[PDB]
Amino acid sequence: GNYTTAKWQPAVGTKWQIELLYALNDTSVDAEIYDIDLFINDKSTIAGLQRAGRKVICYFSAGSYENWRPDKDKFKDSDLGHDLDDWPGEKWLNISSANVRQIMLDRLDMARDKGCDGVDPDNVDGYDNDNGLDLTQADSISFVNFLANAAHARNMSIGLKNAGDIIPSVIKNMQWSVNEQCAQYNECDTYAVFPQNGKPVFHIEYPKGDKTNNDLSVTASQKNAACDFAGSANFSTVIKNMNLNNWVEYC
Numbered sequence: 001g002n003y004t005t006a007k008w009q010p011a012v013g014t015k016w017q018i019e020l021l022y023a024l025n026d027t028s029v030d031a032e033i034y035d036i037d038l039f040i041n042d043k044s045t046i047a048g049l050q051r052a053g054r055k056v057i058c059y060f061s062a063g064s065y066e067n068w069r070p071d072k073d074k075f076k077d078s079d080l081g082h083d084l085d086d087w088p089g090e091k092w093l094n095i096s097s098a099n100v101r102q103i104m105l106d107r108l109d110m111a112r113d114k115g116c117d118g119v120d121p122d123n124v125d126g127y128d129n130d131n132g133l134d135l136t137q138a139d140s141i142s143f144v145n146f147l148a149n150a151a152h153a154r155n156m157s158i159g160l161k162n163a164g165d166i167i168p169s170v171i172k173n174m175q176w177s178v179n180e181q182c183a184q185y186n187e188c189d190t191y192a193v194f195p196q197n198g199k200p201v202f203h204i205e206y207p208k209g210d211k212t213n214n215d216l217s218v219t220a221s222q223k224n225a226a227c228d229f230a231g232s233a234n235f236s237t238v239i240k241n242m243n244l245n246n247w248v249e250y251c
């Protein structure tokens with residue numbers, strides 16, 4: 001088989017929390033899995049989660065350039081394409097570039113060294129966007145399988161972020177899906193194939209819109225929309241602000 005194996009396969013339906021805006025400073029949410037930023041959290045934060053019985057997924061952006069990272073000057077001018085429409089100071093990456101791929105290997109080394117149980121590589125759906133680099137589905141498939149073989153070789157699990165079109169070509173290498181907004185877009189059937197193969201969907205809904213972040217609950221009908229869809233009992237849903245700060249509501 002042209003995939004590699006992972007030792008940690010989280011169960012379908014495992015409750016999770018994700019917080020990417022700042023260093024994690026709240027573990028009061030009783031979730032089994034925490035998805036947090038790879039760079040801004042130290043080994044101590046990660047080990048503390050695991051000592052409390054939790055698994056830690058480390059987020060990083062595999063397909064976009066973030067101009068505030070400490071390794072940003074490793075990227076060459078030719079690695080960078082167009083701006084991401086909805087994220088400031090981010091640009092699409094040429095994920096076929098050997099330089100880009102080596103930078104990502106360096107980020108997986110760091111995730112391994114910090115004790116991450118898994119990695120959550122973002123922005124592998126450049127083909128679905130104005131990337132300015134002629135990126136294609138095959139490029140993403142090649143890149144996602146490259147990341148998965150590299151994470152597995154470092155004893156970490158991995159999952160697919162959105163990128164619904166390429167599921168059949170990477171799923172054997174994936175331990176889960178991270179999906180945004182499939183309920184709002186009536187697309188959760190696309191991602192149900194993961195729990196049909198014993199793999200969770202870590203599923204995010206943003207009912208408050210892309211410009212509103214606060215600590216208030218959503219309305220009952222916004223919660224029904226985020227939570228009620230065929231097979232939702234197999235999705236691990238969080239309701240979040242668009243900025244992915246601490247605030248979270250569960251179904």
Ligand SMILES: *[C@@H]1O[C@H](CO)[C@@H](O[C@@H]2O[C@H](CO)[C@@H](O[C@@H]3O[C@H](CO[C@H]4O[C@H](CO)[C@@H](O)[C@H](O[C@H]5O[C@H](CO)[C@@H](O)[C@H](O)[C@@H]5O)[C@@H]4O)[C@@H](O)[C@H](O[C@H]4O[C@H](CO[C@H]5O[C@H](CO)[C@@H](O)[C@H](O)[C@@H]5O)[C@@H](O)[C@H](O)[C@@H]4O[C@H]4O[C@H](CO)[C@@H](O)[C@H](O)[C@@H]4O)[C@@H]3O)[C@H](O)[C@H]2NC(C)=O)[C@H](O)[C@H]1NC(C)=O
Nearest residue numbers: 021022023024025026211212213214241242243244245246
């Ligand atoms: C985990 O870590 C995170 C990250 O560090 C913690 O979150 C951070 O917490 C800080 C302290 O609470 C906040 O600092 C306050 O910021 C207020 C608004 O700042 C705006 O602009 C910044 C610019 O960068 C921006 O980042 C902010 O955006 C965030 O919020 C929006 C939503 O609004 C999101 O969309 C966005 O994505 C970000 O999440 C934000 O828009 C600022 O007003 C504060 O300075 C004020 O307030 C201080 C305390 O005010 C208190 O006043 C009354 C008494 O009068 C008190 O009883 C009450 O508790 C009030 O809180 C005060 O010390 C300052 O001197 C200043 O006071 C003046 O202004 C107020 C109001 O106008 C007047 O009442 C007052 O008399 C003075 O005139 C703070 O600087 C960070 O924003 C926040 N960062 C985030 C969320 O990203 C988080 O808490 C941690 N969680 C834990 C520990 O559990």
Ligand SMILES: *[C@@H]1O[C@H](CO)[C@@H](O[C@@H]2O[C@H](CO)[C@@H](O[C@@H]3O[C@H](CO)[C@@H](O)[C@H](O[C@H]4O[C@H](CO[C@H]5O[C@H](CO)[C@@H](O)[C@H](O)[C@@H]5O[C@H]5O[C@H](CO)[C@@H](O)[C@H](O)[C@@H]5O)[C@@H](O)[C@H](O[C@H]5O[C@H](CO)[C@@H](O)[C@H](O)[C@@H]5O)[C@@H]4O)[C@@H]3O)[C@H](O)[C@H]2NC(C)=O)[C@H](O)[C@H]1NC(C)=O
Nearest residue numbers: 002003141145164167168169170171172173189190191193
């Ligand atoms: C390892 O090596 C292999 C090389 O062998 C690498 O390639 C991948 O290998 C996979 C394993 O064999 C392979 O996986 C899948 O195998 C399934 C068998 O169960 C297939 O059924 C999958 O088919 C895909 O396409 C289906 C058909 O889609 C057309 O038809 C439907 C029917 O109406 C349309 O809806 C659909 O829109 C589409 O129509 C378009 O295209 C037509 C063809 O050109 C055309 O006639 C139309 O006019 C229209 O333009 C589709 O139904 C499948 O999607 C289902 O499944 C996913 C989850 O898998 C769900 O999310 C969906 O909701 C839906 O239920 C599926 O997309 C598929 O072949 C995989 O394809 C190979 N990938 C390649 C070659 O790129 C592999 O990558 C290597 N690595 C690893 C780790 O494996």
Ligand SMILES: *[C@@H]1O[C@H](CO)[C@@H](O[C@@H]2O[C@H](CO)[C@@H](O)[C@H](O)[C@H]2NC(C)=O)[C@H](O)[C@H]1NC(C)=O
Nearest residue numbers: 078079081094095096097098099132133134135
């Ligand atoms: C993205 O990176 C890839 C890999 O470096 C580039 O593809 C190479 O392009 C040169 C010149 O066209 C060819 O000689 C190589 O054979 C290509 N390699 C591969 C693996 O395809 C690609 O040009 C880059 N994309 C952009 C838009 O610059």
Ligand SMILES: *[C@@H]1O[C@H](CO)[C@@H](O)[C@H](O)[C@H]1NC(C)=O
Nearest residue numbers: 006007008009117154155156
């Ligand atoms: C790899 O991770 C698993 C967690 O599922 C752990 O049990 C195992 O000891 C790890 N192996 C190494 C060499 O760290």
Ligand SMILES: *[C@@H]1O[C@H](CO)[C@@H](O)[C@H](O)[C@H]1NC(C)=O
Nearest residue numbers: 195196198230231232233234
């Ligand atoms: C969850 O997935 C299982 C397959 O593992 C399926 O049999 C079941 O119907 C799904 N649950 C719901 C509520 O659809």
Ligand SMILES: N[C@@H]1[C@@H](O)[C@@H](O)[C@@H](CO)O[C@@H]1O
Nearest residue numbers: 020021061066087243244245
């Ligand atoms: N890549 C960034 C990520 O680092 C985080 O800031 C997030 C909001 O928390 O926005 C984007 O996804």
